[PDB]
Amino acid sequence: DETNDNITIFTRILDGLLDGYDNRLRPGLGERITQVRTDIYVTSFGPVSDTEMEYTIDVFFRQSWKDERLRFKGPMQRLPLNNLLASKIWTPDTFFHNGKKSIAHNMTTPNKLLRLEDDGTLLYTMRLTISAECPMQLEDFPMDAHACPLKFGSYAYPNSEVVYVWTNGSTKSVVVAEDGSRLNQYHLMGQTVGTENISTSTGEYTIMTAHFHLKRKIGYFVIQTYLPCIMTVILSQVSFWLNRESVPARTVFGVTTVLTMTTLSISARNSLPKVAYATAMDWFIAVCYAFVFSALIEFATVNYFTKSQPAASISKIDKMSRIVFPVLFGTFNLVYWATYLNR
Amino acid sequence: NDNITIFTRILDGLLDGYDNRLRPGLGERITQVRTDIYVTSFGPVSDTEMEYTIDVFFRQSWKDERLRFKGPMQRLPLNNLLASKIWTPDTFFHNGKKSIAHNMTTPNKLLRLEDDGTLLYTMRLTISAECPMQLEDFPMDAHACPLKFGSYAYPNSEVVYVWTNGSTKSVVVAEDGSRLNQYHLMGQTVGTENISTSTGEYTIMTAHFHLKRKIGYFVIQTYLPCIMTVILSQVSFWLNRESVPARTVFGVTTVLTMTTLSISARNSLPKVAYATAMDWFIAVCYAFVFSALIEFATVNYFTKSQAASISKIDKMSRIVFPVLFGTFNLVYWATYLNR
Amino acid sequence: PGNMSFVKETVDKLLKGYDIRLRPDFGGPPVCVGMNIDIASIDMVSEVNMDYTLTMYFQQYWRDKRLAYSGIPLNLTLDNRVADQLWVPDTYFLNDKKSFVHGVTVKNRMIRLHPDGTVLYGLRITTTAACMMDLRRYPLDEQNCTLEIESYGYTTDDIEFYWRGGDKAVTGVERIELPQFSIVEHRLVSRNVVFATGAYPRLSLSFRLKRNIGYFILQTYMPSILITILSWVSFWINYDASAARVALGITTVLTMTTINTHLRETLPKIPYVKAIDMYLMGCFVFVFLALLEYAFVNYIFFSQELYKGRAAAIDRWSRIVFPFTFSLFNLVYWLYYVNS
Amino acid sequence: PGNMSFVKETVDKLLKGYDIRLRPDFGGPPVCVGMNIDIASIDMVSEVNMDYTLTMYFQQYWRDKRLAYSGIPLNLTLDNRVADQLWVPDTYFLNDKKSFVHGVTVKNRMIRLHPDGTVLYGLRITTTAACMMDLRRYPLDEQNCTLEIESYGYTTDDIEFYWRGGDKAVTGVERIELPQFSIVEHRLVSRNVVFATGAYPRLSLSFRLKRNIGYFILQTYMPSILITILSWVSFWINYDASAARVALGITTVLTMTTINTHLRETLPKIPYVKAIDMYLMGCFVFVFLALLEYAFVNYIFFSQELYKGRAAAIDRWSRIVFPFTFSLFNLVYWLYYVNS
Amino acid sequence: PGNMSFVKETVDKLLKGYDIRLRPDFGGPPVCVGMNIDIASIDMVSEVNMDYTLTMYFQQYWRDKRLAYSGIPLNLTLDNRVADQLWVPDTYFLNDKKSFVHGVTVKNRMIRLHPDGTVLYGLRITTTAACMMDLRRYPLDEQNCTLEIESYGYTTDDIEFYWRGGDKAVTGVERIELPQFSIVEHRLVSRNVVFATGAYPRLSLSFRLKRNIGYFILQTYMPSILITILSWVSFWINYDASAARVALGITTVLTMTTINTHLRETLPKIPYVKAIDMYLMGCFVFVFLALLEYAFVNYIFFSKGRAAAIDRWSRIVFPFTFSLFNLVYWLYYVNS
Numbered sequence A: 001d002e003t004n005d006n007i008t009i010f011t012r013i014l015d016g017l018l019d020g021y022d023n024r025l026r027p028g029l030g031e032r033i034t035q036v037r038t039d040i041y042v043t044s045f046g047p048v049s050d051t052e053m054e055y056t057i058d059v060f061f062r063q064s065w066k067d068e069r070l071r072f073k074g075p076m077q078r079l080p081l082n083n084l085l086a087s088k089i090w091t092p093d094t095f096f097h098n099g100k101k102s103i104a105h106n107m108t109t110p111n112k113l114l115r116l117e118d119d120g121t122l123l124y125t126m127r128l129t130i131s132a133e134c135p136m137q138l139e140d141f142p143m144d145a146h147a148c149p150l151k152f153g154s155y156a157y158p159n160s161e162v163v164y165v166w167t168n169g170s171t172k173s174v175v176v177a178e179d180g181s182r183l184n185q186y187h188l189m190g191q192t193v194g195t196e197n198i199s200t201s202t203g204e205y206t207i208m209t210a211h212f213h214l215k216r217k218i219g220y221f222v223i224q225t226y227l228p229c230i231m232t233v234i235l236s237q238v239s240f241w242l243n244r245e246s247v248p249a250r251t252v253f254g255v256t257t258v259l260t261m262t263t264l265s266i267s268a269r270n271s272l273p274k275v276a277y278a279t280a281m282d283w284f285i286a287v288c289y290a291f292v293f294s295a296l297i298e299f300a301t302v303n304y305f306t307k308s309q310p311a312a313s314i315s316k317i318d319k320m321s322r323i324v325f326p327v328l329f330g331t332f333n334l335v336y337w338a339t340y341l342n343r
Numbered sequence B: 001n002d003n004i005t006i007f008t009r010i011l012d013g014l015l016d017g018y019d020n021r022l023r024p025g026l027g028e029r030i031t032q033v034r035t036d037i038y039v040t041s042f043g044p045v046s047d048t049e050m051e052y053t054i055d056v057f058f059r060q061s062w063k064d065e066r067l068r069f070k071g072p073m074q075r076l077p078l079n080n081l082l083a084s085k086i087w088t089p090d091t092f093f094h095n096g097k098k099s100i101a102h103n104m105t106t107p108n109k110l111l112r113l114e115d116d117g118t119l120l121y122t123m124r125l126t127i128s129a130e131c132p133m134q135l136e137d138f139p140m141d142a143h144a145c146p147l148k149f150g151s152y153a154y155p156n157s158e159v160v161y162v163w164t165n166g167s168t169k170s171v172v173v174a175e176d177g178s179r180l181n182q183y184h185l186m187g188q189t190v191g192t193e194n195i196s197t198s199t200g201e202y203t204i205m206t207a208h209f210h211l212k213r214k215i216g217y218f219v220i221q222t223y224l225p226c227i228m229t230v231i232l233s234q235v236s237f238w239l240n241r242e243s244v245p246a247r248t249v250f251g252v253t254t255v256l257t258m259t260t261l262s263i264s265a266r267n268s269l270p271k272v273a274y275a276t277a278m279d280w281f282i283a284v285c286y287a288f289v290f291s292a293l294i295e296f297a298t299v300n301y302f303t304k305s306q307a308a309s310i311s312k313i314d315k316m317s318r319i320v321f322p323v324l325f326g327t328f329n330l331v332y333w334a335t336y337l338n339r
Numbered sequence C, D: 001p002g003n004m005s006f007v008k009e010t011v012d013k014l015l016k017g018y019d020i021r022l023r024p025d026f027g028g029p030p031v032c033v034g035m036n037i038d039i040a041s042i043d044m045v046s047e048v049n050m051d052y053t054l055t056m057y058f059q060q061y062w063r064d065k066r067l068a069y070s071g072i073p074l075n076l077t078l079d080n081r082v083a084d085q086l087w088v089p090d091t092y093f094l095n096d097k098k099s100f101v102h103g104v105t106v107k108n109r110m111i112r113l114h115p116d117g118t119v120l121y122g123l124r125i126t127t128t129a130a131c132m133m134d135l136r137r138y139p140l141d142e143q144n145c146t147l148e149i150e151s152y153g154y155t156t157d158d159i160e161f162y163w164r165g166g167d168k169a170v171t172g173v174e175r176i177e178l179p180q181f182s183i184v185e186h187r188l189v190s191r192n193v194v195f196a197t198g199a200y201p202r203l204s205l206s207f208r209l210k211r212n213i214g215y216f217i218l219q220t221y222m223p224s225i226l227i228t229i230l231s232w233v234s235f236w237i238n239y240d241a242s243a244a245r246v247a248l249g250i251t252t253v254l255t256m257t258t259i260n261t262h263l264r265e266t267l268p269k270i271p272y273v274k275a276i277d278m279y280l281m282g283c284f285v286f287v288f289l290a291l292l293e294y295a296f297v298n299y300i301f302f303s304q305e306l307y308k309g310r311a312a313a314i315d316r317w318s319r320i321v322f323p324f325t326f327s328l329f330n331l332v333y334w335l336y337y338v339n340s
Numbered sequence E: 001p002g003n004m005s006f007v008k009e010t011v012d013k014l015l016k017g018y019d020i021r022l023r024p025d026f027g028g029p030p031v032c033v034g035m036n037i038d039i040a041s042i043d044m045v046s047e048v049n050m051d052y053t054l055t056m057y058f059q060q061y062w063r064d065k066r067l068a069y070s071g072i073p074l075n076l077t078l079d080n081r082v083a084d085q086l087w088v089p090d091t092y093f094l095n096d097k098k099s100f101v102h103g104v105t106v107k108n109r110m111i112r113l114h115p116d117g118t119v120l121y122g123l124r125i126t127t128t129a130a131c132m133m134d135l136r137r138y139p140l141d142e143q144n145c146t147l148e149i150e151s152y153g154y155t156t157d158d159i160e161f162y163w164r165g166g167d168k169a170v171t172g173v174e175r176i177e178l179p180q181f182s183i184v185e186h187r188l189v190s191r192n193v194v195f196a197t198g199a200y201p202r203l204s205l206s207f208r209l210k211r212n213i214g215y216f217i218l219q220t221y222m223p224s225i226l227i228t229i230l231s232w233v234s235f236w237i238n239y240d241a242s243a244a245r246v247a248l249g250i251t252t253v254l255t256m257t258t259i260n261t262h263l264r265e266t267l268p269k270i271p272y273v274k275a276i277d278m279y280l281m282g283c284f285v286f287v288f289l290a291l292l293e294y295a296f297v298n299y300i301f302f303s304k305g306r307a308a309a310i311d312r313w314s315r316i317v318f319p320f321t322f323s324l325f326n327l328v329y330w331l332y333y334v335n336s
Ligand SMILES: *[C@@H]1O[C@H](CO)[C@@H](O[C@@H]2O[C@H](CO)[C@@H](O)[C@H](O[C@@H]3O[C@H](CO[C@H]4O[C@H](CO)[C@@H](O)[C@H](O[C@H]5O[C@H](CO)[C@@H](O)[C@H](O)[C@@H]5O)[C@@H]4O)[C@@H](O)[C@H](O[C@H]4O[C@H](CO)[C@@H](O)[C@H](O)[C@@H]4O)[C@@H]3O)[C@H]2NC(C)=O)[C@H](O)[C@H]1NC(C)=O
Pocket: C144, C146, C185, C186, C187, C189, C190, C191, C192, C204, C206, C207, C208
C-alpha cells in the first residue's frame, strides 16, 4: 500500500533519524535512570565440565530500553533498523560476570536484531554462546547436586545510572527450550531467577542472576566403580572358606585381589576432577582396599600360628573371620548409603 | 606553546609528500636494516612436535631520509596511529610455525625517530618455530634450534640485514629467561647467510640456541627399573630347580613386568620411525628376561623329561647371564655417554 | 631526475581509474594465471583427523596491462598493502580444512610489478588439508595425499590456470623430513573440471607417502611374537605340574591383553579394523589355544597305562603343530598384506 | 563504447542510489530466497561433545529489482569484496556451535548478478553443529543429526525460504564416507515455526548415520568371549589341583578387570549406561560366578561318598550349566539390541 | 535546560584539537598513572606449561588537563568507543603469554571523566602469565610467581606508575580458592628498572601458593606404603613354601610397577626428578629387596638354623629401615 511513498518515507525517516544524536551518551543522561528490561531464551544448556569447573550455554539475549531521542513519526508503528544504525546508536554495555569466554555469533551477517517503535522503545536481541564459571563443591562427588549461576549487568554505568529488570517478571522471563537440555553427566532440575546490588571500588552496580539446578546421574558409577569394587571384596572374603593347608592358593587370592583393587583405583582418579579432598567415592575405595588388604593379613596370622604352633586352636580365626568380614562390610555399606542417600 | 605546538606541527609536516609504498632509496642505494634481539623467555621445547617457543623484544633500525626533520629535540617517539603510515621492512621468521604480536592495552609496538631520519622500531613477539631433532640418541642427545629471519619481498639487492653490533652483542638472553624443563641451554651462535629462491636472492640472519637434555629423569624412571627387573629373572638361577611352580611364576611375571616397563617407556618421544637409544636398551633387556625363562625350560626338560639329569645349565647361567648383561651395559653406556 | 618523486606519480597514475571489480581485459580472453609453489614443510600428518598440515610459499603470475609502465628499468617491489588495491585472482584450495596467511611483523604477502604489466603476487600460507587414508594396511600402508587448487567464482571463460615451469613448478619436497613417512614421488596435474555449462580450471599437487615400519617391528610385532613363542614353553613342562603349566598359560594371556590394551592407548584411535589388529588378535588366539591344549591334556590324564600315553602323546603333537601353524599363519600374514 | 567503461559505469550506477538498509520488494510480498547446498565433507562426529562438523558450499538465490541492468548479455560475476555493499539475507544456522567462512587467498564468497535483477550469493562454510545423540544402544546405534537454517530478523511475512530444486537441492551427501558411520539416508524439510517474537521460516537438513560395528566385535566382544571361555577351563581341571583352579580364576578376574578398565579409558567418555557396558558387566558376572563355583567345590571337598561324589558332581553340572547360560545370555543380548 | 545538547557541546569541546600522539603535560613533569586491580579469579595453574591464567578488572587513573570541564557537575561515564579517541597509557604485562579483553556483547572497557580532569580507564582482562616453577619438592612445594606490569614506550621521566591505596590497591585475592593450591599471601611492589633502552617504571603483584597435600596422601603415598608393608608378609610365611613366597614377592613387584607407570601417565609430565620419584623408587627398592631376600634364604636352605635366622632378622630389619627411610624423607622434604 502506498508503495512508492512507503519506501520513500522509510528511508527518509531512517536516514534523518540519526541527526542531533550523540551515541556516546545515555538517554536522559542528566535527568533519569536508564531502565533496561531483559529476557533470555536458552537454546541449549551444557555440556558441563567438572575438570574445568565450567559449563556452556546458548542463549538469545534480549534487552529493551526507551530512548526519547529516537522517537520517529510515521504510519508504521514499528521500524526495524539496519545494523549500520545499530553501531551508531547507544546500547547498554551489558556483560556477564561469570563468562570465561563467549561468542557473539557472526555467521552469514551478524546474529543481531534491533527494532525501533513509535514511542522510542528499542528492542535489541542477539545470539550468544556463554562459557561460564561454575564453582562446585565435591564432597559428594557421585551423588552431589549443584546450582551453576549466570550473572550479568552493566560494566561502566553504575547503579545510579542504569538498572536492570526482568521484562515479564523474575521467574516468568527466562525460558529453556524443550530440546535445550543438552547434558550427559547431569539432569537439570530447574532454574530460579533473581537480582541484587553489588559494590565495587568504581561504585555500585545491579546484577541479574539466574541459577540452573543440576543433579548428577548416578547410574554410570554403579556399574563402573561400586560393583567391581563390591564384587572384588566378595572375592577376597571367599578365601576364608578354602583349606588352610593350601598355602600357595590362599596367598594368590590375597595378593591378586589386591592387584585387582589397584587397577580399579586407577580409573576412579581419571573419572574424578583434580580436587584435593576425599570424596564419597574415595571413602568407598579406601575402605574396600582396607578389607582386601586385611583379608590377606588375616591369612598371614593364620599361616604363622598353624605352622609355628602345630594341635593349636588357630582354626578359630577362620571361623570368626568368616562371619566378621561379611557382616562388618555390610554395616559399612548400610552406613555409607544411608549417609549419602538420605541427604 | 613553544614546547607543545612545535611538537605536533613537526609530525604533521613529515607525511605530506610521503609515500609509504616505496622503500627509502628505490634506485639510489641499498636499505641497511640493523637488528638485535632480547630473549625475555625461552622454551618450552616441544620435542614431541619438534618445535620451541621463544619470547623476544625484536628491534630494527634503518635510515629514512624523508623523515629527517629539524627542531629543538634530537629525537621524538611517534605513536602507532602514525607508525602505520610509515614504511617498515617486511621482516619474517623463515621457520616460524605461529607467532603472536602482542596486542594488550594498545599494541606492544614502539617507533622512535631521530632528527637524522633514523628510525628505531621495537616490538614484543612470542614465536613458535621449527627445530628438527636427531632423536637417535634420545635420552642423551643435543640440539641446535635455529631462528632464521629476513625480508619477505625485498631481495638482497634492495634490503640487507646486519646485526646491530655485528658481534656477540646482538642477541641477549635474560638472566631468568631459561624456562626449560628437560633441557639445559649452554650457549648461542649468531650468523648470516645468503640464499636463492624462485623469487630472487635473499640475505638471512640466523641465531642458534644449543641445548643438552637432562639425563636424570630417564635414569630413575626407565634405566633403573629395567636394570632391577633384569637383576630379577636372574636370582631364580639360585632358587631350587625342583620347585617348578616357583620358577615358572617367577619368570613369566618378570616378562610381564618388562612388558609394562616397555609399554610405559614409549609414552615419550614423537613416535619416530627408527630405534632410539631407549629401544636399544629396552629391547635387549626384554631379551635377557625372555631368555632367562627359556633357560628354565631346557633345564626343567632334562630333569622332569629324562634320572641322569643335567645340572650344567643352572650352574653356568649364574655366571653367563650376569656377565652378558654386564658387558651389554658397559658397551651401551660407553657408546652413548662418551658422545 | 630518476628519483622517487618520479616513481610516486607513476604508481599513482596506475592506480587512478583502476577498478578492482573487473578482471584484466574484462570481456576479453581468459587470464592466464601461472602458479608456483615452494614447500616449506609438512608440519603434521594425522590419521585420527585424516588430514595433513602444509606450509608453503604460494606464487601467482599474471599480466594486467592496466599496470604497465615505462621509463623505470626496475622490477618494482611495492609494500605488501598494495595488494588491497589491485585485482588478484580468487584461487582457493578445495580440500583445505583450515588455513591462514602468516602475519608476524607484517602480513607475509608480496607484489612485484614488471614494466610489461606482469604481476608477481605471492604469500606464505599454512593449510591443513583433508586426505582420506586407507588404513586397512596400517603398518604397511601407502597414501596419495593431494592439494587441490581451484578458482572460486570464475570459470574457464575468464581464468586459466597453469603450472609455471611445468614439472619444475613445485620445489622443496626433497628437503622434507616426516617422522613416520617418506615422500616416494610427487606429480603435478593441470585440468579443466567440467559440469553443466561451467568449465572450471583446477591444478593439483600430489604426494605419495610410504610409512616406515621400524617403530612397529620393535614395539608391536616382536613383543607379540616372543609372547606367542613363550606360551609354547608350557608344552615342554611335564603335564603333572598343573600349577605351573596353568600359571604360564593364563599369565601369558594376561600379557597379550596387556600389550593389546596399551597399544590401543598409543595407536591412532580410528574405529575400523586394520592390519595391526588382525595380527594382535591372531597371536591372542594362539595364546588362547595354548591354554586350551592343557585343558585337554589334564582332563585326559586324570579321566582315565593307556591314558598315561594319551596325555603324553598330545604334547608331542602340540610341540610340532603349534610352531608349524603359527609360522604358517605368520607367513600368510606377510604375504596378503604385502602383495595387496 | 567499450567494456572497460560501459561495465564500470553500469555497476557504479546500480550502487549509486542503493540502500542496503532496506530489503528487496519492501512493503510488497516477502522476498523468496531459494537455497541449495553442495556438501564437501562431514569432518567428524563427536559423542563426547555431541556435535558434528560440516564443510559445504552454501548458496542463496533471490531477486532484487534495484539491481536490474540492460544491454549487457553476460551474467556479471563481481568481486567478492562487493558482497559487503549489497543487501543479503540475514540467514543463520540455529544449531550452529562454531562456524567460519574460509578466507585463505581471498574470502571464499561469490556474487553473480543477472540482467533481470536476480542475485546468486555463494559461500564456503565450515560449521560445527550440535546433534542429539542417544548412546543407550552404543555401539549398535544410529543417529539423526540435522542442520537448521533460519532467518534471524525477519518473520515469514518478510522472508520466505525454499529448497531451490526441491528434494535434490542438497548434493554431495552421496559422495561422502566416514570412519565410524555410513549415511543411510538424508531428508529435506521446510517449515514455518512460530515462537516468542513471530512466525519464522526454517529449512532443515537431516542425515541418518549408522555406525560400523566391526571395530567393536574385534576389540570388545571377542576378547570378553574368549576370556569368559578360558574361565570354564577351571571346571575341567581336577579339583584336587587347588593352585591351578585358583590361579586360572583370579587371573581371569584380573584379565577381565584390565579389559573393562582400559576400554572405557580409550573409547569416548560417556558417563551413563550403554549397551556395551551391559555386556561387559554381564561377562564380569560369569567370570565372577565361575570362581565362586570352585570355592563351593573346595569347601565341599574338604569340609563337607559326598566328599568325592558331590565335588565331582558339581563340576559335572558346571561343565554344561555355565556354557548354556552364556549361550542364552548372548542370544538375549543380540536379539535385544539388534533385532529389538 | 536542553542538557543533551549542552553535554554534547561540552564533550565535543574537549575533543577540539586533541592529539592522540601527545601525553598529558607534554614536555613537562611525568604523567602519574595510578593503578588498581580486582582479581575475578585465579584460573588453571599448570606445571607442564609453567604458566597460570588470571582474570581481573584492570583500572588506571591519570589527569589530563585537556579533559577538564566546569559546566556539568557530574562524573560523566562515556561509551566504550571513546577510549579510541583519547590518550591512554602504553601499559603492558611483561610476563604474559596470551591475553585478551572480554567482548561478550561489547568490548569490556570503561571511560569515566571527572570535572577535575582525572580519567578512569578500566578493562576486563584474562591473561596467561608465565610462572617460574621449581618442582623439586613437588607436591610438598610452595610456589611464588607474579604479574609484572610495565610501560613499553615511556621511561620514568615521561610516565610514573603507582598503586592507588598502597597495599590496599588489590582486591579479590582474599576470596579466591583453587583446587590444588591455597593463597598464603600476596605482596605489592613498585620499583624502577634499568633496561636496554632506558629506565622504566614497574609494578609487581605476587602470590604465594601452597599446594594441598591431601590428594597425594590418599592416592599416591598410602597405596605405596600398603604394598611395601604387604611385601613383609613374605617373612612370616614359612620359607619352605617356595611357590607361595615367590608368588607374593614377585607380584608386589608387579603391582608397584603398575602404580608407578599409571601415576607417571596421569600426573603432569615434568621430565626431572621430584620428591615423589624419590619416594616411589625408594618403595620399589624395598619391595625389590623383600623378594631378593627370599632368594637368599632359599639358597641357604637348599644346600636349617641359618635359613631361619635370616628369616627372623629380616622381620625386624625391614620395618625398622623403612621407618628410618620415612623419617629421613619426610624430615628432608618438610624442613629442608
Ligand atoms: C594421486 O591421485 C590421482 C587421482 O587418483 C592420481 O592420478 C591423477 O589423477 C588426476 C585426477 O585427479 C588425473 O586427471 C590424472 O590423469 C592424467 O591427467 C593428464 C591431464 O589430462 C587431462 O586432459 C585430457 C584432455 O584430452 C583428458 O583426456 C584427461 O582425462 C580425461 O579424459 C580421458 C579421455 O576421455 C578420460 O579417460 C579421463 O577420465 C578424463 O575424463 C584429463 O582431463 C594427462 O596428462 C594424463 O594422461 C593423458 O595424457 C598423456 C599426455 O597427453 C597421454 O600420453 C595419456 O595417454 C593420456 O591421454 C592422465 O590422464 C592422474 N595423473 C596421472 C599421472 O596418472 C595421481 O597420479 C596420484 N598421485 C600420486 C603421486 O600417486
